Each structure stands twice: as structure tokens, then as C-alpha cells.
Ligand SMILES: CC(=O)N[C@H]1[C@H](OC[C@H]2O[C@H](OP(=O)(O)O)[C@H](NC(C)=O)[C@@H](O)[C@@H]2O)O[C@H](CO[C@]2(C(=O)O)C[C@@H](O[C@]3(C(=O)O)C[C@@H](O)[C@@H](O)[C@@H]([C@H](O)CO)O3)[C@@H](O)[C@@H]([C@H](O)CO)O2)[C@@H](OP(=O)(O)O)[C@@H]1O
């Protein structure tokens with residue numbers, strides 16, 4: 001049995017799909033998945049043992065010059081790579097018109113996705129052969145597991161979802177695995193950042209432990225913030241630019257992580273690393289992290305400026321006390 005997954009974006013949503021593959025592999029021996037994913041996240045699906053051919057799309061990049069000749073050629077090539085196999089099922093776990101119309105509609109095989117009432121964009125449901133009702137108010141992980149279970153004809157297991165990607169990293173753990181924490185400071189929107197002074201106070205409060213701290217970055221403004229945080233603290237290292245796989249290796253070796261609500265926090269969750277996520281204006285309810293040792297630190301009044309470094313250190317201490 002060969003299944004095509006359509007689940008293109010964003011980073012966390014791609015990661016959240018992994019436990020559904022693991023469920024399906026256990027219920028259907030020898031099932032294999034191809035996966036249409038945005039090019040920036042193409043590495044993620046390759047880490048799961050049930051995945052064969054990743055089929056990158058670049059919808060977001062194509063939209064700037066959609067009819068430009070090189071773009072028309074990439075689109076053409078994408079359709080050809082999409083239509084190369086006949087799939088036993090095509091599962092659209094995204095539920096957007098972009099995903100349904102630009103990708104799912106063109107693939108060969110029976111097309112499964114969410115119905116009018118449960119899809120993110122209801123009109124996406126017009127493009128499916130098999131519509132499934134997947135209740136909106138559950139964690140993203142559980143929704144996708146339910147969609148896979150209903151699409152492929154097996155009962156949704158009651159056990160906790162298993163991403164099954166940490167084994168891929170078992171063979172490549174950094175040498176200094178266990179001797180550092182990773183601080184994930186970069187996110188999407190000003191009010192979701194923990195103010196810089198609070199990070200630096202936290203870092204300061206860990207002078208006395210002798211722990212090492214590593215700071216990733218994936219764009220210029222993030223590099224500069226990483227440098228301001230590390231300034232004056234010899235136990236803090238600013239990582240060089242790396243691939244998504246590289247930063248995953250780093251996270252896989254971390255004793256623990258402290259993070260804002262961000263893509264790489266969900267990657268941390270997918271790798272089962274202890275993670276303290278700091279939330280203000282976003283609700284850890286449904287798009288909180290799902291996994292082992294994902295801890296939730298709620299800023300007073302939902303405002304991150306009000307959450308002190310002391311309160312976070314104490315939260316770490318209270319949680320280790322297990
Ligand atoms: C037409 C349009 O704008 N489509 C874009 C869309 O969103 C749907 C919806 O957005 C608004 O409605 P809301 O009121 O905000 O619900 C618009 N209305 C108004 C009044 O502004 C409507 O026109 C639209 O129908 O957003 C996409 C970005 O979404 C993703 C992504 O798939 O890439 C997914 C986001 O994830 C969630 C979510 O919060 O909605 C939750 C997950 O658990 C999943 O359930 C997932 C779902 O399967 C859909 O994929 O959605 C989130 O992760 C975001 C990122 O934060 C954004 O960076 O990414 C748009 O895709 P693009 O970013 O343009 O590629 C889509 O074009």
C-alpha cells in the first residue's frame with residue numbers, strides 16, 4: 001500500500017502529522033508514504049521510517065511570479081513528479097484551497113480530506129472524493145491521526161502519539177550531548193517574544209550551575225538578537241547557520257530547551273526533549289506542544305514582559321523535582 005500525504009506547511013503542522021504515519025505503519029504492515037511538502041520543510045518527512053519520496057512544492061515562492069517562465073516550468077515539473085505514481089490513497093491533511101486545488105486535485109488515487117464543517121477552508125472539501133468529519137477542537141496531532149485512521153480503515157489507537165523521529169538522530173548525537181541547554185528565542189510576532197532582558201537574566205541565573213547554552217538563528221535579525229543575548233556570557237554559544245537537520249541534531253543532544261511558541265519548539269517536542277515553552281498571547285490549549293516532557297509556563301496576565309527569569313528558573317527547579 002502506497003499513500004500520498006498532502007501537508008505542506010507550516011513547520012509545526014508538518015511535524016504534527018508524524019504520529020499519524022506511525023499509527024498507520026503499526027496497523028498496516030508495509031505501508032509507505034510519499035509526501036508533498038513546502039521545500040523549506042522537505043527534510044522533516046525523510047526522518048520517519050515509513051516515508052519514501054518527498055515531493056517538494058514551493059507554493060509560497062511561486063505566488064510572487066506565478067506566470068513567469070521559470071515558475072511555470074517548476075510547476076509543470078511538480079505536476080509531473082506528482083502524477084508519476086498511482087496512489088492507493090491521497091490524504092490531504094492541510095484542508096486549504098491551495099493544498100486541495102493546486103495539489104490534491106491533480107494526484108492519481110482516491111482523495112481523502114476534511115468535510116465542509118471541519119476543514120480550515122470549507123471550500124477545500126469540494127475537491128475530495130472522501131470527506132471525513134474531524135472535530136476541530138482537539139490537538140492537531142489527534143486530528144491528523146483521526147483523519148489517517150478514517151481514511152485508511154483502522155481504529156485510532158488510544159496511546160499517546162509517537163513522532164518516531166528521534167531514532168534517526170540516535171546515530172548522530174553531538175559529542176557534547178547532555179552538557180547543554182538550547183534557548184529558542186526567535187518567533188513570529190513581537191508579543192510572542194520573551195523580552196531580551198528576561199532571557200539575559202535567566203542566562204545569568206545559570207552561571208552558578210556551569211551549564212552551557214546554545215542559541216540558534218535562521219535569519220539576520222535573529223542572529224543579532226542571539227548575539228545580544230550571548231554578549232558577556234562565555235558559557236553561551238551562538239551557533240553557526242545550519243540546515244534544519246543540523247539544528248535538529250543540536251536539539252536532540254540538549255538536556256533541556258527553553259522556548260517561545262515557535263516552529264523549533266514543536267521540533268523539540270517531536271524529538272521528545274524536555275522543553276519549557278513560555279506563552280503570553282497564544283493559548284497552549286490546541287497548538288501547545290504534544291510529546292513527552294513538554295512543560296507550559298503561562299506568563300501573568302498573558303503578557304510575556306510580566307514573566308520573570310526567576311519564575312522560569314523556579315519552574316525548571318519545581319519540574320526537575322519529580
Ligand atoms: C485565503 C487565505 O488567506 N488562505 C490562507 C490561510 O488561512 C485560513 C483563513 O484565514 C483567515 O481566517 P481566520 O479568521 O484567521 O480563521 C481569513 N479571514 C480573514 C477575515 O482574514 C480567511 O480568508 C482564510 O480562510 O492561512 C494559511 C496559513 O496557515 C498555515 C499553513 O497551512 O501554512 C496553517 C496555520 O495553522 C493552523 C491555523 O492556525 O489555522 C492550525 C493547525 O493546527 C492546522 O489545523 C492548520 C490547517 O490544517 C491549515 O493548514 O492551520 C499556521 O500554522 C500558519 C502559520 O502560522 C502562518 O505563517 O500556516 C495560508 O497559507 P500561506 O501562509 O499563505 O501559505 C493560506 O494562504
Ligand SMILES: C[C@H](C[C@@H]1O[C@H]([C@@H](O)CO)[C@@H](O)[C@H](O)[C@@H]1O)OP(=O)(O)OC[C@H]1O[C@@H](n2cnc3c(N)ncnc32)[C@H](O)[C@@H]1O
Pocket residue numbers: 009011038039040041058060061186187216217218219222242243244245247262263264
Ligand atoms: C525553513 C524555512 C526556509 C524557507 O522556506 C520557504 C518555504 O518552503 C516554507 O515557507 C522557502 O520559500 C524559502 O526558499 C526558504 O527555504 O523557513 P521558515 O518556515 O520561515 O522557519 C520558521 C522559523 O523557524 C526558524 N528556522 C527555520 N530553519 C532554521 C534553521 N535551519 N536554523 C535556525 N532556525 C531556523 C526560522 O528562523 C523561523 O523563525
